[PDB]
Structure formats: structure tokens, C-alpha cells
């Protein structure tokens, strides 16, 4: 495409335009990133440091940083994995058809075999947390040497699910009744376009001119701020 | 706990396919997900220097494969680590540029910021956590992974029988042209244009 | 829906049975598939628009180079066209005037461009005046404005180590009759750069 | 497994670790009954030859010729004046959106297509 957009120009954020709306006129407003979801995965500082020594005391982690840079292997992860492993092995544990079907169910639950890395749960030479202890695997055949059973490694799929559940974890009265209220709320376009990025418009503008617009803003916004503030201060001085 | 008409408690179900993925009005919640970082930028810089020393000293005994095997990394990751460290050391020792004056792209500057905050939060890894030879694991890896492109179908409709069915017609590998260099010197590069369909080869 | 291709002669019958609406741009058929044509004004007058609109529309009957005579609207305010005047004519429909389907290109031939025009200049053939060009450069001579927050911050942080344009240092905070000084390396940077590049 | 086996055999025969070598094992024979496994072991041994033996070491031809003509240069401070720029970062200043698709194809793509098959850059030649 080329030239200016001919037709209806809507904000890419999905917010309406009007006299008392976030936007005064029609436009794309792709530079206005405050109207889209940008997680804060870094730190934040303050304008002033009251302390007499520059210790970096104002610097602090952002709330979204704890979800941006997670840590896996925590004790609650371990506990959740243990409970879920018990529940997930319930089927093979309570199967009473035969060794063939038991192995089939075990392979379905945790694929493994030659050339594969499994948990070794069903292997005869691996220790399991049974409720009723029994022979590891009558008296005639056994292991005359010590040969302790090796430990069982985790189920990678289930452990990954448990670890990733954190990203999906979500954190009388003045009796005044609302009559101008909505029964079923409302679902505008902005609620979607704020966070679902793939629905928004891809710009045809040159990155050179995008950068130029940023540079112009960095120099012109303070002047407009001071223009309106000076209007207000002059009016107050005149009133005084 | 909902109802199922058949017994198949596994992770390979349409319900569990993309587990934890929103399937209702919660799709519009602005969730924050963990940021992805390269392994060659996650491992500790001292480990990078050690790997670079071993490789630049004895690339035979300390092969890329062996270094990755010992330090839990991939061959590509080891290669990237060595390249980056060699570039940085060349620049530093020749006094061409400091680590904060090499002109880079915006994407690489953002990557540097990402790793800086990752180290400040969790700290650099002291050992690699990758796998040498990735495994055949059923995972969602984009929309391209959810269909049989050759068959052009997402669903395999089939009949119920207790006896063998006719086999499916297998695809035949595409026979595409390739260029294979045969003679390269400081002045001329000669490569053979190969057409795999030509029957008379001589 | 395939009842229209019945029989053996479908390939000749059905292609005849199709929509027969007018061409999209038949309103300008007398340009003969050309972007624009020159013509001679045979008549120049003012016509009354169809109701409810009222007023007078400036129109001319013009004999194109093709020999056809057509009605042409004169867009803009004021014109000098008379009889025997040559005008370039383009496709444009004036809905008010009955039967008017062509307009005259301003600034071409004997049709002078609209006077006292500063917007939509390219649609009336008006050049960018020298005064406008000079103002489009002198306009961005940035103005210095303060809100007393600059004064507070200057007296709290900046006055301690500050340098005048000549390099002189400050020895006291800002008085009540002194404006906040400009930043010697940041204020009016673009305009100053352009002026210095020019000379 | 073949790479590990062959490399371990080579390292032990070379006594890389020992500070006081004990040269006793001198013949190591990997015997296999499967043609595929024997061929894989042979491939591993070939890679080991490439890595260890200077005769069998290989190098891309561009690198080979560049290092053969290798030269030592003397760079002064005044020779890097224009190797450095004013901007800290680099980014693409123009989008890649084509204004006229058919015109672009006719003017800048089609004239250079001397064959309709899609072929990649060849792998480098090993010398």
C-alpha cells in the first residue's frame, strides 16, 4: 500500500474517540503504548533519594517481575508434583489385568523405552513409595547381592505442568443501590486489543518517522504541559 | 468433576492438549508470562570464559560435543558462546571498543537488558540445563504442528473394525534441485547444478 | 442455480444473460477515456441549483477538443472565464447543477488559480508563497516558558553548579525577577542547527 | 554412543590425563555384528580422524584461502575514525512493505530468476 489511509481510521488500542474519551479525534495512535499491555519485567526507581548516601535504596522490583523471572523447583512445586504423581499413577497402580496391560498403561502415561529417557517407575530395579511394602522383585529367585534399588526420576511432562501452573495462578457496606447499572457488564474491543496483540494492526509507517515522532514528543510535550500550567498560574495570580 | 463417557486418563487429550490455556472469557485477562532467554546468555560468564579457553586451547580433546556434554548445553549454544567470547576478547585486547561501546541492534540491546535483570533477580546459572539431543515429545509448537500438511487434514476419519484395513498411500519425497560446490579457489567457485529427476546420470 | 446453463447452447446463451447496469464512470463519457480534455468556453453564466438548495453556481458550456459541447462547473470563489476562453476539463460531478458532469482544472490555460486560498492549495493550483515558506521555518523558533516548578528545581539542585552562556558560574539562587535560564545544549536545538547549517 | 566410545579409546591410547604415562594398551578393536552399528562406528572413527590427525583435518575453502594469504596489518588511531558512529544502536529505517507488488516483482525479482526451482546456498567446500 501507499499514501494516507483512505476511509475509517480507528485507534489500534480499541478505545473510542470523543469529547470526553481517551482520544479526541480519529487516529491509529500506535505510539501510545500506555493503552496496550506491556509487562514490567524490570525494576523501578524514584525521582528523589532521601538518604544521604547513594545506596540505590529507591530501586525496587516491579510486581510483574516476579512472574516474568520465575524460579522453579520450589517446595510447593515439589509438594504439588508429589500429590499429582500419586493421583496420576493411580491407574497403573490399581491395574489388575496383567503385566502386559500394566506396561501398556505405564508407557501411555510416561513414554519410554530403548533410546528414551523415562522415569523408570515401572522398572523392577527402581524404588517406589508403596503404601504396603512388598518384595522389590518366590524365595528361590531373588538378588543374592545387595544391589539397592535406584531412585526414580520425575515425569517431565507432569513436572513442567506443575511448574507452569504459576503463570496461570491468579491473585457492612454503604447501602446505596445502583439503578443505572448493567445486568451483564459489557465487552468492548479495547479489553481484547489491550492484551491480545495479534489482533492489532501492523504499521505501514517508516521506523525512521516513528523514531522522529518520539524525538519530537520528548521535546514538545513539556512545552504543552508548561503552556497549560502557565495559563492556570497566571489566572491564579490575576485572581490573587 | 465433570463427566467422561470413556476412560482414558492421560495428558494426550483435547482437554489437556494445551493445558492451562484459557478457553473462555479469561482469554482477555492480561496475564504475565515468563520471558525467554538464550542459554548462552543464561549461563554464567565465567563458565563461558572457561568453555572458550578449553575450545581455543584443544578443540579436539575439548570438542564442542564434549563441552556440551560436560556442561549440559547444546553444540549450537557452545558455538555461540565461543564466538561471542572470542569477539569480546578480540575487541578488548585490541582496544577497539569496550563492552559498552560496540554498536549493536535494538533487539540485542533489549536482550542484554533481559539477561541483566535475569541475573539480578535469579543469578546466572552455574551449569547448563539444556539437552544434547532433544527427544520426540508431544508438545504444542505452533499452529503448524497441529495438522498433517501433506494430507491437508486435522482429523483422521476412519471406520471401526477388528481386522486389517487397507494401508494409506505414503508420500514420495520431493525431488528438488540443489547446488553442490565441486571446486573452489581464491578466484573461482564452481558448483554442480543437480536435477534429481534426470534419469541418465554420467 | 445451474438452471441457467441447461442444454447445448449454454456457452453462448448464458454469457448474454448478465447484469446490464451502467458503467461505473459513465458520467464522464465525453472525455473519451482520457484523464482530461481541452475545450473552448462557448457560454459562461450562472445557473440555479436544484431545490432545496439556493444560490448561483458558476457554469460554462464548453466545446471540447472532440467537438462535443458539455456543461462544466467552475470550482472555487471567483473566476475570469469569458467566451472564447480555453480551459482544461476533468471528470467531476456537481450534484446541484442539472446535467453537470465535468469540472475545470484551476491554474491551467486561461483559468487562473483561486485567490486568497491557503488550504487545499493543490486542488486549486495555488503555489506555496514565499511568506508561507519563511514562516514554516521561523515558526519553530522555540519559546521559553516556566511554571515555577522549574524555579523550585533550579534553586534546589541546579543553581549550586550552573554555567552561564558565556561560562560564568552562579553564586546565588534565582531571584524573584530572574527567569529560569535556558539549557545551552538543549534549548532550540533544531532551529539553531538549521540556522548554523545554512550559515 | 559411537562418538563417546571412539573418543575415549583415542584419549586413553594418547594418555592425555596421565602425567606419568603407562603405555600398556596399544590395540583396541570395536567389533560389531550389525552392519548399521559397524557403519556408525566407522563414521565416528572417521570424525575422530578428522578431529585428531593433522592429515585428515579439513577447513572451509574461504577460510583456507584467506589464511593462506593471511597478512599482518598496522592499524593506527586515525584509521578508525569512520569505523565508529554517532548512534548507540542500529535499526532498520524503512519497512519492507512493497507499495506495488506486481511492479516490484517485474522490476526487482523476476529478471534475476534464471530458473524456476528454489535452491539454497551450497554448503561450503571442505579442503
Amino acid at each position: 500500500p501507499r499514501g494516507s489511509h483512505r476511509g475509517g481510521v480507528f485507534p489500534v488500542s480499541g478505545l473510542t474517540w470523543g469529547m470526553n474519551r481517551p482520544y479526541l479525534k480519529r487516529g491509529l495512535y500506535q505510539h501510545r503504548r500506555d493503552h496496550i499491555f506491556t509487562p514490567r519485567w524490570g525494576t523501578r526507581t524514584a525521582n528523589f533519594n532521601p538518604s544521604a548516601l547513594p545506596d540505590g535504596s529507591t530501586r525496587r522490583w516491579e510486581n510483574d517481575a516476579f512472574k516474568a523471572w520465575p524460579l522453579y523447583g520450589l517446595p510447593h512445586h515439589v509438594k504439588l508434583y508429589a500429590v499429582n504423581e500419586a493421583r496420576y499413577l493411580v491407574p497403573a497402580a490399581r491395574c489388575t489385568a496383567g503385566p502386559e496391560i500394566t506396561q501398556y498403561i505405564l508407557n501411555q502415561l510416561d513414554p519410554g523405552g530403548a533410546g528414551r529417557n523415562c522415569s523408570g517407575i515401572g522398572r523392577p530395579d527402581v524404588r517406589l513409595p508403596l503404601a504396603k511394602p512388598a518384595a522389590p522383585s518366590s524365595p528361590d529367585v531373588f538378588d543374592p547381592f545387595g544391589t539397592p534399588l535406584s531412585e526414580r526420576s520425575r515425569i517431565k511432562r507432569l513436572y513442567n505442568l506443575v511448574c507452569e501452573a504459576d503463570s496461570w495462578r491468579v491473585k457492612n457496606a454503604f447501602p446505596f443501590v445502583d439503578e443505572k447499572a448493567a445486568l451483564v457488564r459489557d465487552l468492548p474491543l479495547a479489553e481484547i486489543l489491550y492484551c491480545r496483540h495479534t489482533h492489532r494492526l501492523q504499521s505501514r509507517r517508516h521506523p525512521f518517522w516513528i523514531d522522529m515522532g518520539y524525538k519530537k514528543r520528548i521535546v514538545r510535550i513539556p512545552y504543552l504541559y508548561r503552556r497549560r500550567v502557565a495559563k492556570e498560574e497566571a489566572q491564579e495570580r490575576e485572581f490573587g | 468433576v465433570d463427566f467422561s463417557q470413556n476412560r482414558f486418563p492421560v495428558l494426550n487429550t483435547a482437554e489437556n492438549f494445551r493445558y492451562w490455556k484459557d478457553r473462555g472469557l479469561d482469554r482477555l485477562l492480561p496475564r504475565v508470562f515468563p520471558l525467554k532467554l538464550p542459554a548462552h546468555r543464561r549461563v554464567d560468564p565465567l563458565l563461558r570464559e572457561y568453555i572458550f579457553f578449553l575450545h581455543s586451547m584443544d578443540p579436539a580433546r575439548f570438542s564442542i560435543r564434549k563441552l556440551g556434554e560436560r556442561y549440559g548445553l547444546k553444540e549450537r549454544t557452545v558455538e555461540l558462546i565461543c564466538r561471542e567470547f572470542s569477539v569480546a576478547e578480540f575487541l578488548r585486547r585490541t582496544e577497539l571498543a569496550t563492552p559498552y561501546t560496540r554498536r549493536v541492534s535494538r533487539e540485542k540491546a533489549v536482550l542484554r537488558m533481559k539477561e541483566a535483570l535475569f541475573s539480578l533477580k535469579l543469578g546466572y546459572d552455574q551449569l547448563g540445563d539444556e539437552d544434547l539431543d532433544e527427544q520426540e515429545e508431544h508438545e504444542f509448537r505452533g499452529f503448524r504442528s497441529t495438522q498433517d500438511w501433506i494430507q491437508r487434514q486435522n482429523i483422521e476419519v476412519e471406520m471401526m473394525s477388528a481386522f486389517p484395513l487397507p494401508a494409506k498411500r505414503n508420500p514420495l519425497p520431493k525431488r528438488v534441485d540443489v547446488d553442490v560446490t565441486v571446486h573452489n579457489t581464491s578466484k573461482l567457485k564452481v558448483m554442480n547444478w543437480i536435477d534429481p529427476n534426470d534419469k541418465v546420470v554420467f | 442455480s445451474t438452471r441457467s446453463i441447461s442444454g447445448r447452447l449454454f456457452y453462448k446463451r448464458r454469457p448474454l444473460q448478465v447484469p446490464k447496469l451502467k458503467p461505473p464512470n459513465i458520467r464522464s463519457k465525453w472525455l473519451e477515456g482520457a484523464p482530461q480534455k481541452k475545450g473552448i468556453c462557448v457560454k459562461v453564466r450562472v445557473q440555479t441549483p436544484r431545490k432545496p438548495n439556493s444560490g448561483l453556481r458558476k457554469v460554462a458550456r464548453v466545446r471540447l477538443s472532440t467537438g462535443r459541447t458539455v456543461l462544466v462547473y467552475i470550482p472555487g470563489i471567483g473566476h475570469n472565464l469569458n467566451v472564447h476562453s480555453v480551459v482544461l476539463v476533468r471528470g467531476g460531478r456537481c450534484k446541484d447543477v442539472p446535467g453537470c458532469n465535468y469540472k475545470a482544472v484551476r491554474g491551467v490555460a486561461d483559468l487562473l488559480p483561486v485567490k486568497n486560498r491557503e488550504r487545499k492549495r493543490s486542488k486549486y493550483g495555488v503555489k506555496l508563497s514565499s511568506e508561507k515558506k519563511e514562516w514554516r521555518l521561523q515558526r519553530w523558533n522555540n519559546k521559553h516558558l516556566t511554571i515555577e516548578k522549574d524555579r523550585e528545581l533550579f534553586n534546589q539542585f541546579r543553581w549550586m553548579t550552573w554555567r552561564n552562556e558565556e561560562g560564568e558560574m552562579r553564586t546565588s539562587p534565582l531571584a524573584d525577577d530572574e527567569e529560569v535560564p535556558r539549557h545551552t545544549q538543549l534549548f532550540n536545538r533544531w532551529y539553531r542547527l538549521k540556522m548554523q547549517r545554512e550559515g | 554412543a559411537a562418538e563417546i566410545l571412539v573418543e575415549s579409546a583415542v584419549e586413553q591410547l594418547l594418555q592425555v590425563d596421565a602425567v606419568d604415562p603407562n603405555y600398556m594398551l596399544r590395540k583396541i578393536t570395536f567389533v560389531d555384528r550389525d552392519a548399521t552399528n559397524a557403519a556408525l562406528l566407522a563414521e565416528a572413527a572417521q570424525a575422530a580422524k578428522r578431529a585428531w590427525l593433522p592429515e585428515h583435518q579439513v577447513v572451509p575453502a574461504p577460510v583456507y584461502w584467506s589464511q593462506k594469504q593471511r597478512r599482518l596489518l598496522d592499524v593506527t588511531d586515525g584509521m578508525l575514525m569512520f569505523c565508529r558512529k554517532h548512534t548507540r544502536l542500529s535499526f532498520k529505517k524503512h519497512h519492507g512493505v512493497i507499495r506495488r507488488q506486481k511492479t516490484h516483482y517485474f522490476s526487482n525479482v523476476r529478471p534475476f530468476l534464471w530458473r524456476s526451482s528454489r535452491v539454497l546456498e551450497p554448503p561450503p567446500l571442505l579442503l
Binding site: - | - | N141, R192, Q196 | -
Partner: peptide, 25 residues
């Protein structure tokens, strides 16, 4: 409706060019 002064353009003071400090491989 004060907007500023504009009396001192500050054009006589030259704008120092940015240095070429960033290396390009």
C-alpha cells in the same frame, strides 16, 4: 495568554556535534 519570550534564539552558540564513539564491526 503568555507563551514565552523568543527574544533569545541562542543561535550564536554552536551546537557541538555528537562524537563517533560507537564501534561497528
Amino acid at each position: 495568554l503568555v507563551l514565552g519570550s523568543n527574544a533569545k534564539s541562542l543561535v550564536d552558540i554552536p551546537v557541538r556535534p555528537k562524537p563517533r564513539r560507537f564501534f561497528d564491526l
